[PDB]
Ligand binder design. Structure first.
Ligand code: FMN
Ligand code: FMN
Ligand code: FMN
Ligand code: FMN
Ligand code: 9O3
Ligand code: 9O3
Ligand code: 9O3
Ligand code: 9O3
Lengths: 334, 334, 334, 334
């Protein structure tokens, strides 16, 4: 039985080959931004409210035209067959059963149409490719397969410097491939080409500057993910959680504002929502659960997160996610 | 001989079964709010005054119509027979003899009428129950038994996630019961029902938001306890000591403002009073003393705390608790 | 050869009996204020000036009508025969030869007249006693013996709670006595009685509140020492170095403003002067040198401190102590 | 293969004699300013921009009339034959081949004319000497040999207190000499004498006070290096990186503003440029590479730094160094 997300990390570290654990856990450079994602959340404290009606606490949200069971989605994580033989299918089935959106990756190790066929109203994460037409074909494939949003990753003009992977000489095993089939820097022109090619909401993942959040709204984005890519891209990039409040104020409801990086409990979800997030993404912990126990492991993680989110909301006096967004916070020292 | 409260923790850890020590020591979740209660006090420094008349230093206060020997009461702690066979009776006798109020718990392991019969003008802590009538009957029982204040706990719509207890599989031994005999979320309506049912002062324990402190005064509370429940409820809730000054300013004398969480010396009592508290509650250390040496252990703890409070007040130039409330503080780094 | 003051602490720890080392090193309570004296200095960084004339760097100051070779005096430390058989005489001889004022203590283990006969224009530290007439007789004795200033300690209405001493059961050996022969709280009336009884400058040692520094000037003090008594009195009292700049601004040249607590190098002297101190006191390191090597040890400490002060001043562009007081500082993180 | 600058430090520590490693690694006093150079950079986080054109990312700058391949130069480091038998010639050849300026030192262990003959448009670092005419002759020698800038070190009126060197009894081996052949405090008059004696840009290295940066522009300096001399001069001097933004604002383009101290990656270069630096100097890491592998080691270090600078710039949305200077930063906690 798992009682915290950290139990799942310990389980995944036991089972996975070291170099695959390092691919999953690592960040770029000195890993300063990886560590800072955790430090930044640890410094945030919630000011809970008391004595409110909790007859019908609900953790549901409406986002991108669908009800979701929690203010959370599974982050895009490439090559999930690295962690378990059922890879993306195991995670997508558990997310569907939990009512949580799952983000299908451009670098999925099972084709996007197979994962979409699991059901659950999934999203699709796009990398812009040197061949533009391939990127736009991926968007059309995702839409035709029933994906509900395009999560355009805007912080990977190229992959960051992953020193653990370099030191391990890590490469994909022969049995893991990019099943949808290189990176080209995306620009605002690329965003507009995607927006013109689809009716789905376009969500820009990897925004940290306030001006880029404003420009995303002006560009017609339906959402942004405030994110430093889990500390895997620019080493020294500010954590998303440290930019979130300023960004939420600047867009002033013009798009959904998600955040990711280091969310490791329902209490962390509560902190993100109190700082103004519409929802969070969760990356590494979902893969820990997949490595530890496959689909059932992911189901147990999502049940644990749902319990922790409900617990934290009610302890803070919030019968709905909207009420949680109106909580105040205080920075402290750890 | 004990020369600090930390000597009592070491003694209690030696004697108690591990799972009972963990029930006592633990907090919710990652224990971030438990640790932060200590960090927050450690960052506060007092600016002492010199050269004042200390002919007649007194640590007494008047609160809820009674003189108390120190600006301190024993916090409500459930199930004290877990720590010593005399449980609540041992603690209540020592508190009476020291002139300190003792808070009888709804979850006491000796009935509230037995503990009240010890004397000492006790308080009574109320949990709101699914059966409302049971809660209101408890209030009437407490009043009929001579309790002087109703300490309504407002931060437990349900118990937080106590991971040590889950991991230990902790349960009450067969020989410990709730001797007054489930939780229902309390609301402001519950507060009003209690206020209408009693002539005693109603004290809301577990307030952290400034607006909830203001509303408590408007609701007719005679006091509040600024508290995160010793880090046992919302993991990530701000420490009470970090909200205390703002709350004292907002209520501007409209009710007594107590604080708890991490008070471990007379110097900590002085810090709380300099931040504006009327009095503190002390929880875990009283149980350490009870575990270590029963009634005599509690007596020794209260004598040590009285000596440390007198010492700190006089070293800071304060002949009375009111003067201590006018001290200034400075945040520092530890 | 000693190249830092920390070499002397290591040497003194080797030679002294543990309980005497603990009497010297210890503070009150949890030792939070003892540690904070060091943390507070470590957080201060100097902004040095370049390209100034350093033809004739001088570390001298004029204070209380005498030239001193450094902006430093030996702090009052009781019972110096605990550390070396020559006790106060060894320290006073080395201070005289270095041109540094030495503070003779009320609790000296050699009589104040013997120590004054060493020469060197000494100061005299006064404790107010239950028998007032004894305190005023001490002042007259000190003046008749040629002491140049009365350092009235205002932060010891009684001794703080020295837990190391309690735990060690420390007591003075039979061969160490208060050779000038209990504490009574001093008040502003006591200050005025001393000021009326002597022509010497009265320096109030142990001021931390800005208002008490202002009142000291109004009371006719010639100086104050901004100090928490080396963390030995109120545990949780702010470090003097954290109050110094505010106090220097409030008195606006109306008296000399000294500081002590944790000065462990010439660079620390420079930080204190850049924060506005007229001079520092140094306590524990002088006793380390005395324990390690007697008079010659103290001489070596004072020569090392003089070299470090000259080095730091010149590296910061300061040909005089007055120029060092005009340096700016920046708080940083350690 | 080296994947970070820290790999080179480990390699250099293996090969060098301990006392030479300590000469290289050490700082003055307690090494507080040495450590603070790293802490200060670790606290700075970059706010990267996304979706910008990265077709032609260039790391080049124009400085002192020459194009440089990176916003970096090799800092002046005395006596490079201590680290490798080819000393300065090995480093200068690698810097030339990488397109990076190399600063020839007054205390070079190979004559300045030999090092200049390597090519690469070098700079020359000047110490002011007791015999002024020797300093001015050095300037003329450097100019006649083709050096492009005079880097006048203004923070060494004398050498700081290097406790590692004292404790090791470090001295130059007989086979290392000052091949160009004592310190005199330099003043603003010395700066003017140099400016009058040369047509080359004069760069004042070791400025930390804002007023001294302003005065440097007024004095006709072409640049300054904001620097605490790698923590080797005043122990307790603020890190240059903590003064850089204020200094850049005060000079408001009147001279080039470089910074040094603790630059250990391309990400650190990016932080310095986002705080407004025109370029950085790098000291110790260049010597680590020289010790580890001679000229080829330096080449590998400079190739690694070039890759990290390009990577960090592009990940932050910057196609040029000028764009990197317009990035914003946020202080965080580590
Ligand atoms: C192993 C791994 C692979 C990832 N692959 C992608 C990817 O292909 N596309 C993308 O937009 N983000 C990718 N991410 C970033 C995540 O979507 C997410 O931003 C980061 O992991 C969130 O932080 P968390 O892992 O701390 O929860 C990846 C993360 C990891 C750990
Ligand atoms: C073992 C334990 C049981 C407690 N039971 C109750 C309770 O029944 N009702 C309540 O209002 N608080 C309860 N508390 C909270 C305390 O009253 C108090 O808020 C917290 O312990 C104060 O902090 P301290 O222990 O750091 O002094 C309990 C605390 C502990 C440690
Ligand atoms: C062992 C010891 C004894 C002291 N005795 C006295 C005293 O009799 N009177 C007094 O005013 N201060 C006394 N002090 C305080 C010092 O004068 C000084 O304020 C404190 O030691 C300064 O800090 P430092 O030791 O960190 O340099 C004593 C300090 C120590 C360590
Ligand atoms: C061993 C050593 C010798 C140095 N010699 C000189 C020197 O002769 N002249 C000078 O201006 N700076 C000298 N410096 C300072 C460097 O130019 C530079 O300011 C400092 O090393 C920069 O920091 P970094 O080493 O952290 O990169 C020296 C530094 C070291 C480590
Ligand atoms: O973080 C990852 O591993 C990634 O997002 O898939 C990549 F490789 F594109 F950068
Ligand atoms: O902290 C406790 O253990 C408590 O307050 O008694 C409970 F259980 F109600 F939450
Ligand atoms: O700090 C000391 O030991 C003292 O100042 O001498 C005392 F005892 F008076 F408090
Ligand atoms: O830091 C150095 O070692 C130096 O700059 O060369 C010196 F010696 F001049 F101070």
């Amino acid at each position: 039985t798992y009682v915290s997300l950290a139990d799942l990390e310990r389980a995944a570290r036991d089972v996975l080959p070291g170099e695959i654990f390092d691919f999953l856990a690592g960040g770029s450079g000195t890993e300063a931004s990886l560590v800072a994602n955790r430090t930044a959340l640890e410094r945030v404290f919630v000011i809970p409210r008391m004595l409110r009606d909790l007859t019908d606490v609900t953790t549901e949200i409406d986002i991108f035209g669908r009800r979701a069971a929690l203010p959370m989605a599974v982050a895009p994580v490439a090559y999930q067959r690295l962690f378990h033989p059922e890879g993306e299918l195991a995670v997508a089935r558990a997310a569907r059963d939990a009512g949580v959106p799952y983000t299908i990756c451009t670098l999925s190790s099972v084709s996007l149409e197979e994962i979409a066929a699991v059901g659950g109203r999934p999203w699709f994460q796009l990398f812009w490719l040197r061949d533009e037409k391939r990127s736009l074909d991926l968007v059309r494939r995702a839409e035709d397969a029933g994906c509900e949003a395009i999560v355009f990753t805007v912080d990977v003009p190229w992959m960051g410097r992953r020193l653990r992977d370099m030191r391990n000489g890590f490469a994909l095993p022969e049995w893991v491939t990019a099943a949808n089939f290189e990176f080209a820097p995306a620009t605002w022109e690329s965003v507009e080409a995607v927006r013109a090619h689809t009716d789905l909401p376009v969500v820009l993942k990897g925004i940290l500057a306030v001006e880029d959040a404003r420009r995303a709204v002006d560009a017609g984005a339906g959402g942004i993910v405030v994110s430093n890519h889990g500390g895997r891209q620019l080493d020294g990039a500010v954590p998303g959680i440290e930019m979130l409040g300023e960004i939420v104020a600047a867009v002033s409801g013009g798009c959904e504002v998600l955040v990711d990086g280091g969310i490791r409990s329902g209490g962390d979800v509560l902190k993100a929502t109190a700082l103004g997030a519409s929802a969070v993404l969760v990356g590494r912990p979902v893969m820990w659960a997949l490595a530890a126990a496959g689909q059932d492991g992911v189901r147990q993680l999502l049940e644990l997160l749902a319990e922790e989110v409900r617990d934290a909301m009610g302890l803070a006096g919030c019968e709905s996610v909207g009420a949680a967004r109106r909580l105040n916070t205080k920075l402290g020292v750890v």
